[PDB]
Amino acid sequence: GGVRLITLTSELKSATVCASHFCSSATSGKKSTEIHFHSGSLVGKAAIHVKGALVDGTEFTFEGSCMFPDGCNAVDCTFCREFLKNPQCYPAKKWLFIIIVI
Amino acid sequence: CDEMVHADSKLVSCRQGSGNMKECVTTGRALLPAVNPGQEACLHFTAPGSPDSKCLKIKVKRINLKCKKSSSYFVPDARSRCTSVRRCRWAGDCQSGCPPHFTSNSFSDDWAGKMDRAGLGFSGCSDGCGGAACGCFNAAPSCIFWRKWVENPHGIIWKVSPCAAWVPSAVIELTMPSGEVRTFHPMSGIPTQVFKGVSVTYLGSDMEVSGLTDLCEIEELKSKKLALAPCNQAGMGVVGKVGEIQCSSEESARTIKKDGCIWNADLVGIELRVDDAVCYSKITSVEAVANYSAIPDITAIRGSFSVNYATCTGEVTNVSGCYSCMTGAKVSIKLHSSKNSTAHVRCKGDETAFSVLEGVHSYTVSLSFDHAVVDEQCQLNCGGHESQVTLKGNLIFLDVPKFVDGSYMQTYHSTVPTGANIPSPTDWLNALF
Amino acid sequence: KKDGCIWNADLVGIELRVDDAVCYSKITSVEAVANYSAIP
């Protein structure tokens, strides 16, 4: 989630109604390409989002009415940033190793 | 809510009805920006009275394109039917010359008074057979009168409304400082108003505009599916448009008794017969007749309000991490206090204001911000001089802490720097010479 | 009270309700409705 458009959450239904009514959106500005599908059967929903957050709990039910899922994520991906890389304690005993054997 | 601006403390109309609880009234208007969607905005209020403060919150959910409804229309399922009354000459004293005037709403020939399944079906004289073979004991042409019914056998009807334009809108929820919650259909491009509670709100900035063809909605009352119709419309009905039978009555939708359900002449087509007449329909259906498709600074106005009139702690705890991200990073705060009261801004944060409303027990709150290093001074919430400090390093789009492959790559990044300055210097002045 | 203060039709916009009606305003404010300046 974030810049990219597609995520993967497994949504499951115990439903038999003829058609699923209007569901709702996730957080972080999500307008999905689908909130309704056939609902008379037991079919999973591989939902895609734009969130890219950690808690991963938001309100999204035709009638589910704000169920709370959970999420946990690492911090490692491609890094395209703007500001300075890092300021650290190299001056004490690590700046001496800056100039190395070329 | 990183976005919030306090109220104005100069418009004050307070009457001291109760000594413990001051009673105040304020009105006016509000001017606040709008967020990129998916959060909840707040609105803080003050008073010349020192202790009490109040707040109002606004939630935003979606960005979407819908438009206004100019006028609603209903269309039943018209079906052709007809009856003919066969009258011989000299029986009923038929008009040897048919009179152009007709009592079409009575039918004095056949039951001058009766409710019919008809939308005022027209009547016409016709030249029937004459003679003994026709059984009229006369060579004079027969005397046949007729009636049209416009009827719906089984009722499926559609509410029809045109916009012929499209303006962006959103979703807005209201939180009354008393505690009431309200939402509606906000139309945030055109200055629509909502009149509920005590106050009124209206549009946001028209950042984006687009052009789209003039179209409508359509959807079954039994909800087959939504769809889209050219839906050319007016108070009356032109030939070949999307709705030829205009009605505004769901009560008279299935059956047609009120004249509000309007029509046009001779949509139902008639074929004459020697003894009777045969009726067919030139009317069209609801689908595919011309269809080309199926399914694919928010601010407020302030009325005369009713807004009326502690021991606390530091209650701080841990931090979450994100910076330069438009959402932020939450911080948890676990308070117990003595009044069902609120909190207010700090000095050193330089990010936004506090929006916290708590009660009399140990609770906890979470609020999202973003920073480089964590500073947090001067939070004046309960009126007491309390300040709290936490030192932490916040997440940014930062280097990789796991692999440190950049520390390997950047170390090897320096290559042949002085060599390019040494060999090229051997042919620098000579080439210049 | 005096009719000297004149107006125009349906500046205040109405929304119909099943039991009542809801009134909103199509009127504009005093500032920034078309303003292009304040004090020089």
PDB file of N, CA and C in Angstrom, chain B residues 13-58:
ATOM      1  N   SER B  13     -22.594  35.481  23.796  1.00  0.00           N
ATOM      2  CA  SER B  13     -23.908  35.771  24.367  1.00  0.00           C
ATOM      3  C   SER B  13     -24.196  34.705  25.427  1.00  0.00           C
ATOM      4  N   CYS B  14     -23.794  34.993  26.661  1.00  0.00           N
ATOM      5  CA  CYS B  14     -23.896  34.054  27.770  1.00  0.00           C
ATOM      6  C   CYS B  14     -24.839  34.610  28.826  1.00  0.00           C
ATOM      7  N   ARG B  15     -25.793  33.790  29.259  1.00  0.00           N
ATOM      8  CA  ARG B  15     -26.655  34.121  30.385  1.00  0.00           C
ATOM      9  C   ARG B  15     -26.382  33.135  31.512  1.00  0.00           C
ATOM     10  N   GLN B  16     -26.258  33.655  32.733  1.00  0.00           N
ATOM     11  CA  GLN B  16     -25.887  32.842  33.891  1.00  0.00           C
ATOM     12  C   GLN B  16     -27.146  32.246  34.526  1.00  0.00           C
ATOM     13  N   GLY B  17     -27.766  31.330  33.781  1.00  0.00           N
ATOM     14  CA  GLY B  17     -28.922  30.624  34.310  1.00  0.00           C
ATOM     15  C   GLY B  17     -28.583  29.787  35.528  1.00  0.00           C
ATOM     16  N   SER B  18     -27.455  29.083  35.482  1.00  0.00           N
ATOM     17  CA  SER B  18     -26.974  28.278  36.598  1.00  0.00           C
ATOM     18  C   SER B  18     -25.580  28.749  36.984  1.00  0.00           C
ATOM     19  N   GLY B  19     -25.338  28.869  38.289  1.00  0.00           N
ATOM     20  CA  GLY B  19     -24.029  29.304  38.749  1.00  0.00           C
ATOM     21  C   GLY B  19     -22.934  28.303  38.437  1.00  0.00           C
ATOM     22  N   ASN B  20     -23.202  27.016  38.675  1.00  0.00           N
ATOM     23  CA  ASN B  20     -22.204  25.990  38.388  1.00  0.00           C
ATOM     24  C   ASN B  20     -21.919  25.898  36.895  1.00  0.00           C
ATOM     25  N   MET B  21     -22.967  25.854  36.075  1.00  0.00           N
ATOM     26  CA  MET B  21     -22.832  25.665  34.639  1.00  0.00           C
ATOM     27  C   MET B  21     -23.255  26.941  33.927  1.00  0.00           C
ATOM     28  N   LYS B  22     -22.288  27.656  33.361  1.00  0.00           N
ATOM     29  CA  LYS B  22     -22.595  28.819  32.542  1.00  0.00           C
ATOM     30  C   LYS B  22     -23.306  28.397  31.260  1.00  0.00           C
ATOM     31  N   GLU B  23     -24.308  29.183  30.871  1.00  0.00           N
ATOM     32  CA  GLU B  23     -25.060  28.968  29.642  1.00  0.00           C
ATOM     33  C   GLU B  23     -24.659  30.025  28.622  1.00  0.00           C
ATOM     34  N   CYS B  24     -24.272  29.582  27.426  1.00  0.00           N
ATOM     35  CA  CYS B  24     -23.764  30.482  26.402  1.00  0.00           C
ATOM     36  C   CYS B  24     -24.403  30.174  25.057  1.00  0.00           C
ATOM     37  N   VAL B  25     -24.485  31.205  24.219  1.00  0.00           N
ATOM     38  CA  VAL B  25     -25.010  31.104  22.863  1.00  0.00           C
ATOM     39  C   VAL B  25     -24.063  31.847  21.930  1.00  0.00           C
ATOM     40  N   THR B  26     -23.820  31.275  20.753  1.00  0.00           N
ATOM     41  CA  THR B  26     -22.961  31.903  19.759  1.00  0.00           C
ATOM     42  C   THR B  26     -23.448  31.501  18.374  1.00  0.00           C
ATOM     43  N   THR B  27     -23.209  32.372  17.396  1.00  0.00           N
ATOM     44  CA  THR B  27     -23.599  32.127  16.013  1.00  0.00           C
ATOM     45  C   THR B  27     -22.485  32.636  15.105  1.00  0.00           C
ATOM     46  N   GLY B  28     -22.773  32.707  13.807  1.00  0.00           N
ATOM     47  CA  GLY B  28     -21.805  33.207  12.851  1.00  0.00           C
ATOM     48  C   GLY B  28     -21.552  32.276  11.683  1.00  0.00           C
ATOM     49  N   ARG B  29     -20.281  32.078  11.344  1.00  0.00           N
ATOM     50  CA  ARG B  29     -19.911  31.224  10.226  1.00  0.00           C
ATOM     51  C   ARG B  29     -18.511  30.683  10.474  1.00  0.00           C
ATOM     52  N   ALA B  30     -18.162  29.637   9.729  1.00  0.00           N
ATOM     53  CA  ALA B  30     -16.877  28.972   9.866  1.00  0.00           C
ATOM     54  C   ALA B  30     -16.163  28.920   8.523  1.00  0.00           C
ATOM     55  N   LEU B  31     -14.839  29.054   8.569  1.00  0.00           N
ATOM     56  CA  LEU B  31     -13.991  28.969   7.385  1.00  0.00           C
ATOM     57  C   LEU B  31     -12.791  28.091   7.716  1.00  0.00           C
ATOM     58  N   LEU B  32     -12.845  26.830   7.299  1.00  0.00           N
ATOM     59  CA  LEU B  32     -11.788  25.863   7.550  1.00  0.00           C
ATOM     60  C   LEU B  32     -11.441  25.149   6.253  1.00  0.00           C
ATOM     61  N   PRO B  33     -10.186  24.730   6.090  1.00  0.00           N
ATOM     62  CA  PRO B  33      -9.810  23.985   4.879  1.00  0.00           C
ATOM     63  C   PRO B  33     -10.390  22.580   4.863  1.00  0.00           C
ATOM     64  N   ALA B  34     -10.107  21.828   3.803  1.00  0.00           N
ATOM     65  CA  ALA B  34     -10.549  20.447   3.670  1.00  0.00           C
ATOM     66  C   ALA B  34      -9.339  19.538   3.523  1.00  0.00           C
ATOM     67  N   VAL B  35      -9.469  18.312   4.023  1.00  0.00           N
ATOM     68  CA  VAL B  35      -8.363  17.369   3.992  1.00  0.00           C
ATOM     69  C   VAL B  35      -8.412  16.545   2.710  1.00  0.00           C
ATOM     70  N   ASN B  36      -7.284  15.926   2.392  1.00  0.00           N
ATOM     71  CA  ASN B  36      -7.323  14.759   1.532  1.00  0.00           C
ATOM     72  C   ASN B  36      -8.025  13.636   2.292  1.00  0.00           C
ATOM     73  N   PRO B  37      -8.968  12.935   1.664  1.00  0.00           N
ATOM     74  CA  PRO B  37      -9.987  12.203   2.435  1.00  0.00           C
ATOM     75  C   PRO B  37      -9.465  11.090   3.334  1.00  0.00           C
ATOM     76  N   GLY B  38     -10.314  10.648   4.261  1.00  0.00           N
ATOM     77  CA  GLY B  38     -10.004   9.507   5.104  1.00  0.00           C
ATOM     78  C   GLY B  38      -9.610   9.823   6.531  1.00  0.00           C
ATOM     79  N   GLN B  39     -10.069  10.946   7.083  1.00  0.00           N
ATOM     80  CA  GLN B  39      -9.766  11.320   8.461  1.00  0.00           C
ATOM     81  C   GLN B  39     -11.002  11.929   9.111  1.00  0.00           C
ATOM     82  N   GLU B  40     -10.788  12.548  10.271  1.00  0.00           N
ATOM     83  CA  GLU B  40     -11.849  13.210  11.026  1.00  0.00           C
ATOM     84  C   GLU B  40     -11.324  14.566  11.478  1.00  0.00           C
ATOM     85  N   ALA B  41     -11.960  15.639  11.019  1.00  0.00           N
ATOM     86  CA  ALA B  41     -11.571  16.998  11.367  1.00  0.00           C
ATOM     87  C   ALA B  41     -12.290  17.441  12.633  1.00  0.00           C
ATOM     88  N   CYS B  42     -11.691  18.398  13.337  1.00  0.00           N
ATOM     89  CA  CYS B  42     -12.223  18.898  14.596  1.00  0.00           C
ATOM     90  C   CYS B  42     -12.443  20.406  14.522  1.00  0.00           C
ATOM     91  N   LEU B  43     -13.005  20.950  15.602  1.00  0.00           N
ATOM     92  CA  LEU B  43     -13.284  22.384  15.689  1.00  0.00           C
ATOM     93  C   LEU B  43     -13.408  22.749  17.162  1.00  0.00           C
ATOM     94  N   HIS B  44     -12.445  23.511  17.673  1.00  0.00           N
ATOM     95  CA  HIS B  44     -12.362  23.838  19.090  1.00  0.00           C
ATOM     96  C   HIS B  44     -13.038  25.174  19.369  1.00  0.00           C
ATOM     97  N   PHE B  45     -13.553  25.326  20.589  1.00  0.00           N
ATOM     98  CA  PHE B  45     -14.254  26.533  21.001  1.00  0.00           C
ATOM     99  C   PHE B  45     -13.717  27.014  22.342  1.00  0.00           C
ATOM    100  N   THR B  46     -13.841  28.321  22.575  1.00  0.00           N
ATOM    101  CA  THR B  46     -13.356  28.940  23.802  1.00  0.00           C
ATOM    102  C   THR B  46     -14.466  29.718  24.495  1.00  0.00           C
ATOM    103  N   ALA B  47     -14.106  30.477  25.529  1.00  0.00           N
ATOM    104  CA  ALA B  47     -15.048  31.320  26.252  1.00  0.00           C
ATOM    105  C   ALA B  47     -14.259  32.281  27.125  1.00  0.00           C
ATOM    106  N   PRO B  48     -14.759  33.501  27.339  1.00  0.00           N
ATOM    107  CA  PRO B  48     -14.117  34.381  28.327  1.00  0.00           C
ATOM    108  C   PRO B  48     -14.078  33.772  29.715  1.00  0.00           C
ATOM    109  N   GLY B  49     -15.079  32.972  30.077  1.00  0.00           N
ATOM    110  CA  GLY B  49     -14.990  32.146  31.263  1.00  0.00           C
ATOM    111  C   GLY B  49     -13.807  31.207  31.152  1.00  0.00           C
ATOM    112  N   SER B  50     -13.018  31.099  32.226  1.00  0.00           N
ATOM    113  CA  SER B  50     -11.724  30.423  32.114  1.00  0.00           C
ATOM    114  C   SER B  50     -11.842  28.909  31.956  1.00  0.00           C
ATOM    115  N   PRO B  51     -12.560  28.171  32.828  1.00  0.00           N
ATOM    116  CA  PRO B  51     -12.328  26.720  32.901  1.00  0.00           C
ATOM    117  C   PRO B  51     -12.811  25.919  31.698  1.00  0.00           C
ATOM    118  N   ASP B  52     -14.037  26.154  31.241  1.00  0.00           N
ATOM    119  CA  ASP B  52     -14.673  25.258  30.282  1.00  0.00           C
ATOM    120  C   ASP B  52     -14.168  25.489  28.863  1.00  0.00           C
ATOM    121  N   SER B  53     -14.147  24.411  28.082  1.00  0.00           N
ATOM    122  CA  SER B  53     -13.924  24.459  26.646  1.00  0.00           C
ATOM    123  C   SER B  53     -14.714  23.333  25.992  1.00  0.00           C
ATOM    124  N   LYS B  54     -15.042  23.519  24.715  1.00  0.00           N
ATOM    125  CA  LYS B  54     -15.840  22.557  23.968  1.00  0.00           C
ATOM    126  C   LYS B  54     -15.252  22.374  22.576  1.00  0.00           C
ATOM    127  N   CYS B  55     -15.672  21.298  21.912  1.00  0.00           N
ATOM    128  CA  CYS B  55     -15.140  20.963  20.599  1.00  0.00           C
ATOM    129  C   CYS B  55     -16.216  20.298  19.753  1.00  0.00           C
ATOM    130  N   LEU B  56     -16.059  20.416  18.436  1.00  0.00           N
ATOM    131  CA  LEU B  56     -16.910  19.757  17.456  1.00  0.00           C
ATOM    132  C   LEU B  56     -16.025  19.068  16.429  1.00  0.00           C
ATOM    133  N   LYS B  57     -16.462  17.906  15.949  1.00  0.00           N
ATOM    134  CA  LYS B  57     -15.664  17.096  15.043  1.00  0.00           C
ATOM    135  C   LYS B  57     -16.436  16.797  13.764  1.00  0.00           C
ATOM    136  N   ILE B  58     -15.691  16.641  12.671  1.00  0.00           N
ATOM    137  CA  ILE B  58     -16.247  16.360  11.352  1.00  0.00           C
ATOM    138  C   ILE B  58     -15.470  15.201  10.744  1.00  0.00           C
TER     139      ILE B  58
END
